[PDB]
């Protein structure tokens, strides 16, 4: 029991920082192709090999986190903003911008620790308004007319997470019956909320700034044959999470007590809905009449009236 | 679950017909499927109307047409070259996989099986010529080879098609002794064995014995050995039944395969003496000499130490007598041009014969042997310890 | 001559493929064939071939592979399978590596020191064919290892000396033919437990001096160098874990007595107040897990750490020593140098090479990842129980080796034997966490899935092999609390193929459905966590069973009833286990079960539910008549009447245990009242009273495969839970009609008591 | 059926009796000279008890007629060695055997 407690709460307590020195010395061509470039090419070929299910690939899951954690009073705010661009260019010119797209496309809509690890890499590589990386990704998607990326995004969005009241009250009854240990993944009521937030932050960074090209390519993939609408999928997920929030509030009616779980599981969904709203705001931020009309002729009005109804009483 | 489509006035207000176009790959695959099935049914009818009985030869036998169609269809499944870009290679792999799937889901593998069945009822090009004509007789072999190549290409990579048609292995291994298509049948069986582990579940002792008899009949083929290797393990997993069958039916007799052994390096020593008898000048035709030993060892490393002595002939009237060519395990008595003795047996032409002697024993230390030689009427003789 | 094949290409290729076949027929742990192959080639011809310089290359590689396969492969694989499981005893020799030399400016050498770790023993039988009736030849043919290791060292030195000068005639043709088989043999020899400390020092000095890593080596050579370095890191990880255990021994020795001493002090100096209970609840409550979790926490400035502050500093010293022993600020140095140096030198094809290189580099850079991965899989038991756990590990290794082979008759027999041995072993009970850390349940499940594959409804072959695994898993889940949670994860899969093993009273125990029930049995936490992705599946299975009878039964010759009362009864038993727990019905499970049952009304018996049969009275009477009349059965056979009676009794017992409660929540709740009303409308009361009042006979014994007295207990439970006893005339009439006759039949006993 | 042809005499004094263990050094071989077994390759002599039914009859009945230090060629019969089934993998059915047996020690 001592060694179990030791390995549980003594060793993995963030006792190292190498994610920058490693990648720094992994790009020096001391003498062709750099070692980091060879690694990116290996990952890209593995993601391009035709299969039926994205394997675990512990090597990829281990290195896509180091490459992600490698990235990140006027001069003190400009020097870091330029060093971030330098750290992003340290690996986005070696093929990571296309490697992330291929890894997302090779999962065809399966929520796993591979997409959950490549979305964080995409976040780290598109931190801020990196119009250069955005244009590289757009040019890649337009020159290789693949649908398996947009349909994979749709399949991922269709099964992200929703606050379910039955499992929440079931866990509450279990806690009342006995002191059962708390489930790690949001008490098993909100599944991979961090994954959902990362996916929607990625979709936001893909259109950050005022990139009208990508704003229109997310609505109509001109050049393909089975285009899918990402704006409508985002609206559908927002409506789902709105109905979930409304039901979770209707559960907490009459009782003027909000416990720790009732606060945490609610704040998680609040953050998820805020991220979805920011993503829609970035979709329609530039005066793009396409996305304007797409949001007009959709089910966003039901979501916003439900949000108004829940706000007027929660306030 | 099938719901028939009836055209009527009222109908149901839930149809919702959505169009969906197919790619050029799928459309061309369907059209070539129709074309090849039409041509193959024509060929099957033309061959059956001739093989069923003696009928008037107003039949359509598209010999050259079906040959060209097979030559095109074989290249239609050509795997991508290894000297190609990775993405283009993966695209070609996916394309040929979809092609193989669409060709299998129409059951034309069974069609080419029926074709080779109806073609195997003959024995040779001469047998087919006087029945179907000279051109068909001389092209029967090429048509069979092309059909087997196409059958192999249809199963080269798919895991589904091999496990689907594995039930036909009872016929392939039976026809494996055709002697004019054994290479094609062996390639097909190898490609179906290295892919699906389900096909190995139906391989019985009869099939393994047939393969070993093929290896014994057609000589030393290095592909039968690959087939036997693929029969032991398929995908990281072994089958003890087939392993035991191979070990018990292939190498108990040692006739096959090539055996091996570790022998010793033997040498010979001879003085500058030559004895030639004929008419005229003779040398009394009588000779004698002794031999003793100081130290000996029966087994120095692993085997009995070679130790023989005798008289060796020559070829004509020159040196270099014939025998074990050189630098081998052949001493005296291992050829028809030498006669030796080693204490127990008399050696002549690598064949030993035991002889009686008072206290017959191997040539241990401090042993004196005496070799006598008369030429004309008697022969070489040995006396051990007198 | 062997060397003459150099010119003859046909015989060379044929003999190469012959050697490949020799290795393939004995590739895995099959020794009956290897004992034959040894004589088929030779004992010393292999040594001559591996030592000879003028070999054709292909033949050299083939002979090397064959030598590895016939003897070394089996024990090498058996020792590599147990390479990530660090079981270490508490012997006084184990309490000697607590220094793990790292201070005074030194770091030690990899693989040098002391192990004191449980590893599978090696033993080889002597190949003899004049001895009749060999005992088992279970392990391997004997081979002299000292001569082999000496020759390997000599040839490796000669090979590195040859490669340093870069000649144009490497042994066996090119340089890969010279290097790959030699380093492969050296690698498997290093794996199998030879090259003791002194020899390992020379083997290190072969590459380390700051050699072999600095040369211009081909891709297949560096690919084996990667595995060599991976083992050189694994042995260091094992040494670190052993040192951790050695220090933890003394730490726990100094901690447990100090905790007991402070407890005795605070119990002697009582000073009873309102805070002493809060201080001393930790001793009785707070099981040792969270006890040690809360008594071992000092990374911030201060926590509620008890009075033993002296041991805190020694733990800090040991932690800093571990940190400096790891890469956190000399093997990591040169490994990280070479890994990047190769990639900088040239672009590398053969993606497996670059994959191994990068996983090695990442391992060296993380350092603590190996520790956080391996420490859960470590374990310590005692210095006394060693032979028992060694036999257990050997049996588990045999289980895994049999898993790696396709299922056959002899394979099934060996697996059954090994399962029996691990069940009979004592460590199975004393250390239940050890089995979970070793993954015995996952191994048995991945063996069972191989047998359960092949088909779904056309073959259930190897039934004993199916059953033994189920019974082992049942025992494993039974003796624990956490193993039930472990098997609950796999519960989802086996409910898909739970239809096997039913319709046959040969396995009333071992069954996938029964192992599911055992996993979900008697735990409210798991009963709640049993959500609804599978209850609808079980209900659909029940409906299909109540709609279709068993084709196996109609083949055996049963009268082809319009439904099946066996698999339905099994599904009802599983649903009962899911809904009823510890005497209190799980409310959510009960509600969803009633909802699914009413949504799919075919699950109920056709005699009870439907526009045909009336209900339970006529159903039970007809079942009794069918049991009495042998014309409606199999001409030990399945009594169809008894099976129908058991099905209906199981359904009624399920509904009764699924009733809301004893009116604790039902008194003030609405949905509970609604569920009770649904049950009452589904099952009439008079039908229940009539079924209770049958007054079975009391028998020279008789056969109990008919109207069993337990059938009445289900009706009694349903009456008590759904309706209850609160009316005087109702209670009296029930006692008159359904209780007095059975009471008289029970009281009329003198000696002939065949039914308890 | 087993016959013995001596190669080197072993002073013919000590013979194997019931209740003893004998140490031999043998290089078996098939009828056509193809060696199928040997005890000198592994460099370990073969120790076996006399009369315990652990080796083949063609070997034990032949060794029971030899002396210490006596080399012999023992020619066996298929029925007394392996029968009509032989040894699966090595010995074919209905095969005769030849053993070059030397007696090192007699305990």
* Catalytic residue status for D99: yes
Most A CBs within 10 Å, among B24, B90, B92, to test the A interface: B90
Q: Edge-to-edge strands of the sheet including D71-75? A: D3-8, D71-75, D97-106, D21-30, D46-49
SS3 D80: helix
User: Which residues in chain B touch residue A225, judged by CB atoms under 8 angstroms apart?
Assistant: 21
End-to-end CA distance of chain A: 48
B234: tokens are 């398929």
User: Which residues in chain B touch residue A49, judged by CB atoms under 8 angstroms apart?
Assistant: 90
- What is the distance, to the nearest Å, from the Cα of residue A29 to the centroid of all Cα atoms in its chain? 33
SS3 B347: strand
Cα A55 from Cα A52, distance rounded (Å): 9
CA atoms within 13 A on the CB side of B66: 27
- Exposure letters C273-289 (e unless 16+ CB within 10 A, then b): eeeeeeeeebeeeeeee
Instruction: Give the technique used to solve this structure.
Output: cryo-EM
Of D41, D44, D56, nearest to C130 by CB-CB distance is D56
* Catalytic residue status for D26: yes
User: Which residues in chain A touch residue B90, judged by CB atoms under 8 angstroms apart?
Assistant: 48-50
Cα C346 from Cα C342, distance rounded (Å): 6
Tell me if there are at least 3 CB pairs under 8 Å linking chains B and C. yes
Q: Give the angle subtended at the CA of D92 by the CAs of D91 and D94, to the nearest 5°.
A: 110
Q: What are phi and psi of C58, to 5 degrees?
A: -60, -45
H-only helix segments in B105-165: 108-119, 125-132, 134-154, 159-165
Closest CA to C440 of C497, C398, C382, C386: C398
CB contact under 8 A, D40 and B344: no
**Angle at which helices C440-452 and C482-494 pack, to 10 degrees?**
20
Strand partners, D4: D74
Cα C263 from Cα C266, distance rounded (Å): 5
Of B220, B229, B233, nearest to C14 by CB-CB distance is B220
C648, C620 contact by CB (below 8 A): yes
SS3 B304: strand
C689, C738 contact by CB (below 8 A): yes
Cα C125 from Cα C107, distance rounded (Å): 40
By CB neighbour count within 10 A (0-12 exposed, 13-18 middle, 19+ buried), where does D37 fall? buried
Residues C542-546: contacts with CB within 8 Å, 24+ apart?
A: C542/C568, C542/C571, C542/C572, C542/C575, C542/C600, C542/C603, C543/C600, C543/C602, C543/C603, C545/C571, C546/C602, C546/C603, C546/C604, C546/C605, C546/C606
Cα C592 from Cα C603, distance rounded (Å): 14
Cα C542 from Cα C604, distance rounded (Å): 9
B62, B39 contact by CB (below 8 A): yes
By CB neighbour count within 10 A (0-12 exposed, 13-18 middle, 19+ buried), where does A68 fall? buried
CB contact under 8 A, D91 and C129: yes
Q: How many CB atoms lie within 10 A of CB B101?
A: 13
Nearest CA in chain B to D44: B302
C627: tokens are 């049991």
Most A CBs within 10 Å, among B19, B87, B99, to test the A interface: B87
C149, C189 contact by CB (below 8 A): yes
Cα C39 from Cα C545, distance rounded (Å): 59
Of C248, C319, C367, nearest to A3 by CB-CB distance is C248
Cα B170 from Cα B166, distance rounded (Å): 9
Maximum pairwise Cα distance, chain B: 129
Residue matched to tokens 């089910």? A299
Closest CA to C602 of C646, C547, C652, C648: C547
Q: How many CB atoms lie within 10 A of CB B281?
A: 7
Catalytic residue among D26, D50, D91, D98: D26
Most B CBs within 10 Å, among A41, A44, A47, A50, to test the B interface: A50
B341, B358 contact by CB (below 8 A): no
Which positions 162-201 of A are in contact with C (Cβ < 8 Å)?
A: 166-167, 170-171, 173-174, 177-178, 180, 188
Q: Which chains have at least 3 CB atom pairs separated by less than 8 Å from chain C?
A: A, B, D
- The helix (run of H) or strand (run of E) holding residue D4 is strand D3-8
End-to-end CA distance of chain D: 26
Q: Where is chain C discontinuous (C–N over 2.5 Å), named by the preceding residue?
A: 210, 329, 635, 699
Q: What is the DSSP letter of B306?
A: P
Question: To one decimal place, what's the resolution in Å?
Answer: 3.3
CA dihedral C185, C189, C192, C194 (to 10 degrees): 170
CB contact under 8 A, B362 and D8: yes
CB contact under 8 A, B87 and A48: yes
**Angle at which helices C288-295 and A2-9 pack, to 10 degrees?**
50
Q: Is D88 left (phi over 0), alpha (psi -120 to 50) or beta?
A: beta
B240, C408 contact by CB (below 8 A): yes
Closest CA to C166 of C153, C175, C176: C175
B276, D72 contact by CB (below 8 A): no
By CB neighbour count within 10 A (0-12 exposed, 13-18 middle, 19+ buried), where does B265 fall? exposed
Residues A182-186: contacts with CB within 8 Å, 24+ apart?
A: A186/A264, A186/A265, A186/A268
Q: What are phi and psi of B137, to 5 degrees?
A: -65, -40
Which positions 18-57 of A are in contact with C (Cβ < 8 Å)?
A: 18, 22, 25-26, 28-35, 38-39, 42, 45-46
DSSP 3-state helix, strand, coil percentages of chain C (rounded to 5)?
60, 0, 35
Cα B262 from Cα C150, distance rounded (Å): 22
SS3 D87: strand
Chain A closest CA to B58's CA: distance in Å? 51
CA atoms within 13 A on the CB side of C720: 9
Beta strand pairing call for C86-87 and C378-379: parallel
- DSSP letters along D36-50, please? ---STTTT--EEEES
Nearest CA in chain C to D43: C144
Cα C25 from Cα B247, distance rounded (Å): 7
Cα C720 from Cα A147, distance rounded (Å): 62
Cα C61 from Cα C266, distance rounded (Å): 73
- What is the distance, to the nearest Å, from the Cα of residue C707 to the centroid of all Cα atoms in its chain? 41
- Which residues touch D71 (CB under 8 Å, ≥6 apart)? B298, B362, D6, D7, D8, D10, D100, D101, D102, D103
Q: Is B267 left (phi over 0), alpha (psi -120 to 50) or beta?
A: beta
SS3 C300: coil
* Catalytic residue status for D37: yes
CA dihedral C111, C116, C120, C121 (to 10 degrees): 100
Catalytic residue among D50, D59, D82, D98: D82
* Catalytic residue status for D50: no
Cα-only R_g, chain A: 22
SS3 B382: strand
Cα C405 from Cα C30, distance rounded (Å): 10
Chain B closest CA to D19's CA: distance in Å? 30
- Exposure letters B167-184 (e unless 16+ CB within 10 A, then b): eebeebbeebeeeebbeb
DSSP 3-state helix, strand, coil percentages of chain B (rounded to 5)?
45, 10, 45
From residue B372, alpha-carbon distances to B286, B350, B382 in Å are: 8, 22, 6
C80, C172 contact by CB (below 8 A): no
A310, A246 contact by CB (below 8 A): yes
Cα C359 from Cα C226, distance rounded (Å): 10
Which positions 577-596 of C are in contact with A (Cβ < 8 Å)?
A: 588
Residue matched to tokens 């059965």? C633
- Which residues touch C222 (CB under 8 Å, ≥6 apart)? C342, C353, C357
- DSSP letters along B201-269, please? GG--HHHHHHHHHHHHHS---HHHHHHHHHHHBSSS-B-HHHHHHHHHHHSSS-SSS------------
- DSSP letters along C661-721, please? -SSTTTTT-SHHHHHHHHHHHHS-HHHHHHHHTT----------SSS-THHHHHHHHHIII
Cα C721 from Cα C679, distance rounded (Å): 10
* Catalytic residue status for D36: yes
From residue B215, alpha-carbon distances to A188, B211, B227, C196, C737 in Å are: 63, 6, 11, 47, 85
């Amino acid at each position: 029991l001592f060694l179990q407690g030791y390995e549980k709460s003594w060793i993995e307590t963030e006792e190292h920082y190498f994610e920058d020195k490693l990648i720094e010395d992994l790009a020096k061509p001391g003498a062709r192709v750099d070692p980091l470039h060879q690694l990116i090419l290996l990952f890209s070929r593995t993601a391009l090999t035709e299969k039926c299910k994205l394997e675990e690939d512990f090597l990829y899951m281990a290195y896509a986190d180091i490459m992600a954690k490698s990235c990140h009073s006027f001069e003190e705010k400009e020097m870091e903003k330029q060093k971030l661009l330098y750290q992003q260019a340290r690996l986005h010119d070696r093929g990571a911008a296309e490697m992330v797209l291929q890894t997302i496309s090779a999962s065809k809509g399966e929520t796993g620790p591979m997409v959950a690890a490549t979305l964080k890499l995409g976040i780290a590589i598109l931190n801020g308004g990196n119009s250069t990386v955005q244009q590289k990704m757009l040019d890649y998607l337009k020159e290789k007319k693949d649908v398996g990326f947009f349909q994979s995004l749709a399949g991922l969005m269709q099964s992200c997470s929703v606050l379910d009241l039955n499992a929440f009250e079931r866990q509450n009854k279990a806690e009342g019956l006995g002191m059962v240990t708390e489930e790690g993944s949001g008490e098993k009521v909100l599944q991979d909320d961090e994954f959902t937030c990362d996916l929607f932050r990625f979709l936001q960074l893909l259109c950050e700034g005022h990139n009208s090209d990508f704003q229109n390519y997310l609505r109509t993939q001109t050049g393909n044959n089975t285009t899918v609408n990402i704006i409508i999928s985002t609206v559908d997920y927002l409506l789902r999470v709105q109905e979930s929030i409304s039901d979770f509030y209707w559960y907490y009616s009459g009782k003027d007590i909000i416990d720790e779980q009732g606060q945490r599981n609610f704040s998680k969904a609040i953050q998820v809905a805020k991220q979805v709203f920011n993503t829609l705001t970035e979709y329609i931020q530039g005066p793009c009449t396409g996305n304007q009309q797409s949001l007009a002729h959709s089910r966003l009005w039901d979501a916003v009236v439900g949000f108004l109804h829940v706000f007027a009483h929660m306030q | 679950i099938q719901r028939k489509a009836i055209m009527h006035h009222e109908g149901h207000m839930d149809d919702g017909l959505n169009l969906s176009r197919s790619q050029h790959e799928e459309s061309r695959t369907a059209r070539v499927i129709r074309s090849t099935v039409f041509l193959f049914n024509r060929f099957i009818r033309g061959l059956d109307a001739l093989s069923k009985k003696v009928k008037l030869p107003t039949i359509d036998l598209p010999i050259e047409s079906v040959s060209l169609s097979l030559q095109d269809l074989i290249g239609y499944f050509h795997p991508p070259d290894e000297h190609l870009e990775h993405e283009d290679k993966q695209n070609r792999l996916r394309a040929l996989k979809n092609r193989q799937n669409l060709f299998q889901e129409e059951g034309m593998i069974n069609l080419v099986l029926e074709c080779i069945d109806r073609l195997h009822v003959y024995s040779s090009a001469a047998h087919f010529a006087d029945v179907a004509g000279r051109e068909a007789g001389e092209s029967w072999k090429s048509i069979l080879n092309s059909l087997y190549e196409l059958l192999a290409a249809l199963i080269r990579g798919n895991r589904k098609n091999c496990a689907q048609f594995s039930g036909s292995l009872d016929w392939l291994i039976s026809r494996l002794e055709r002697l004019e298509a054994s290479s094609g049948i062996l390639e097909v069986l190898h490609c179906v064995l290295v892919e699906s582990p389900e096909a190995l579940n139906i391989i019985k002792e009869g099939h393994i014995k047939s393969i070993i008899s093929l290896l014994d009949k057609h000589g030393r083929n290095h592909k039968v050995l690959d087939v036997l290797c693929s029969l032991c393990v398929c995908h990281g997993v072994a089958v003890r039944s087939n392993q035991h069958l191979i070990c018990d039916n292939l190498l108990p007799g040692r006739d096959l395969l090539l055996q091996t052994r570790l022998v010793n390096h033997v040498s010979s020593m001879r003085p500058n003496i030559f004895l030639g008898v004929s008419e005229g000048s003779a040398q009394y035709k009588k000779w004698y000499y002794e031999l003793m030993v100081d130290h000996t060892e029966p087994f120095v490393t692993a085997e009995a130490t070679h130790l023989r002595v005798g008289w060796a002939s020559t070829e004509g009237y020159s040196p270099y007598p014939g025998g074990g060519e050189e630098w081998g395990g052949n001493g005296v008595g291992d050829d028809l041009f030498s006669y030796g003795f080693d204490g127990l047996h008399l050696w002549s032409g690598c064949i030993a014969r035991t002889v009686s002697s008072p206290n017959q024993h191997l040539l241990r230390t401090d042993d004196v042997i005496s070799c006598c030689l008369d030429l004309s009427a008697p022969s070489i003789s040995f006396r051990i310890n007198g | 001559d062997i060397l003459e094949l150099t010119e003859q290409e046909e015989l060379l290729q044929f003999h190469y493929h012959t050697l490949r076949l020799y290795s393939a027929v004995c590739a895995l742990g099959n020794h009956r064939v290897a004992h034959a192959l040894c004589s088929h080639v030779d004992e010393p011809q292999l040594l001559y071939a591996i030592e000879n310089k003028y070999m054709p290359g292909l033949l050299r590689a083939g002979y090397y592979d064959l030598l590895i396969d016939i003897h070394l492969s089996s024990y090498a694989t058996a020792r590599l399978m147990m390479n990530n499981e660090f079981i270490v005893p508490m012997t006084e020799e184990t309490k000697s590596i607590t220094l793990f030399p790292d201070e005074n400016k030194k770091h030690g050498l990899p693989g040098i020191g002391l192990s004191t770790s449980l590893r599978p023993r090696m033993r080889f039988s002597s190949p003899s064919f004049v001895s009749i009736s060999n005992d088992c030849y279970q392990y391997s043919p004997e081979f002299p290892l000292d001569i082999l290791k000496a020759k390997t060292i000599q040839m490796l030195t000669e090979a590195v000396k040859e490669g340093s000068l870069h000649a144009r005639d490497p042994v066996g043709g090119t340089t890969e033919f010279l290097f790959v088989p030699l380093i492969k043999l050296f690698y498997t020899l290093l794996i199998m437990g030879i090259f003791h400390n002194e020899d390992l020092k020379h083997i290190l000095q072969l590459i380390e001096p700051s050699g072999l890593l600095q040369m211009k080596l081909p891709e297949p050579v560096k690919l084996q160098m990667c595995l060599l370095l991976q083992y050189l890191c694994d042995c260091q990880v094992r040494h670190r874990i052993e040192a951790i255990v050695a220090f933890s021994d003394d730490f726990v020795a100094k901690l447990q007595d100090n905790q007991r001493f402070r407890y005795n002090e605070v119990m002697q100096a009582l000073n009873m107040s309102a805070a002493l209970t809060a201080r001393k609840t930790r001793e009785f409550r707070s099981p040792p897990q969270e006890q040690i979790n809360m008594l071992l926490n000092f990374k911030d400035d201060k926590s509620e750490c008890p009075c033993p502050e002296e041991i805190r500093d020694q733990l800090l010293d040991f932690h800093e020593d571990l940190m400096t022993h790891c890469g956190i600020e000399s093997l990591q140095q040169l490994i990280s140098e070479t890994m990047v140096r190769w990639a900088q030198e040239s672009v590398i094809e053969d993606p497996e090479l670059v994959r191994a290189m990068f996983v090695l580099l990442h391992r060296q850079y993380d350092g603590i990842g190996g520790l956080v991965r391996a420490l859960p899989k470590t374990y310590t038991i005692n210095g006394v129980s060693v032979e028992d756990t060694i036999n257990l590990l050997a049996s588990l290794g045999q289980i895994r080796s049999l898993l790696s082979v396709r299922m056959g008759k002899e394979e099934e027999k060996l697996m059954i034997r090994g399962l029996g041995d691990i069940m009979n072993n004592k460590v199975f009970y004393q250390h239940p966490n050890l089995m979970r850390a070793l993954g015995m349940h996952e191994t048995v499940m991945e063996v069972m899935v191989n047998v359960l594959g092949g088909g779904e409804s056309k073959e259930i072959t190897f039934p004993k092999m199916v059953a033994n695994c189920c019974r082992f898993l049942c025992y494993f889940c039974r003796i624990s609390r956490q193993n039930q949670k472990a098997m609950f994860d796999h519960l989802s899969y086996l409910l898909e193929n739970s239809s096997v093993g039913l319709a046959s009273p040969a396995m009333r125990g071992s069954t996938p459905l029964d192992v599911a029930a055992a996993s979900v049995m008697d735990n409210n936490e798991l009963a709640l966590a049993l959500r609804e992705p599978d209850l609808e599946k079980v209900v659909r299975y029940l409906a299909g069973c109540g709609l279709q009878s068993c084709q196996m039964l109609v083949s055996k010759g049963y009268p082809d009833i319009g439904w099946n009362p066996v698999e339905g009864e099994r599904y009802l038993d599983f649903l009962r286990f899911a809904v009823f727990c510890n005497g209190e019905s799980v409310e959510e499970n009960a509600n969803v079960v009633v909802r699914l049952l009413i949504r799919r009304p075919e699950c109920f018996g056709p005699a009870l539910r439907g526009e045909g049969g009336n209900g339970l009275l006529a159903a039970m009477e007809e079942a009794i008549k069918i049991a009495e009349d042998p014309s409606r059965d199999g001409p030990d056979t399945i009594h169809m009447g008894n099976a129908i009676m058991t099905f209906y009794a199981a359904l009624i017992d399920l509904l009764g245990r699924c009733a809301p409660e004893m009116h604790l929540i039902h008194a003030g709740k609405g949905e509970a009242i609604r569920i009770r009303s649904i049950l009452r409308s589904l099952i009439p009361l008079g039908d229940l009273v009539g079924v209770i009042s049958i007054a079975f006979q009391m028998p020279e014994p008789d056969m109990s495969a008919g109207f069993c007295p337990d059938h009445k207990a289900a009706m009694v439970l349903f009456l008590d839970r759904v309706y209850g006893i609160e009316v005087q005339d109702f209670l009296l009439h029930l006692l008159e009609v359904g209780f007095l006759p059975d009471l008289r039949a029970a009281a009329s006993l003198d000696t002939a008591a065949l039914s308890x | 059926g087993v016959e013995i042809e001596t190669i080197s005499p072993g002073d013919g004094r000590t013979f194997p009796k019931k209740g003893q263990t004998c140490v031999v050094h043998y290089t078996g071989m098939l009828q056509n000279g193809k060696k199928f077994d040997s005890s000198r390759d592994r460099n370990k002599p073969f120790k076996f008890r006399i009369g315990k039914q652990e080796v083949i009859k063609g070997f034990e009945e032949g060794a029971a007629q030899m002396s210490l230090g006596q080399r012999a060629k023992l020619t066996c019969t298929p029925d007394v060695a392996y029968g009509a089934t032989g040894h699966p993998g090595v010995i074919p059915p209905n095969a005769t055997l030849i053993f070059d047996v030397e007696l090192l020690n007699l305990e």
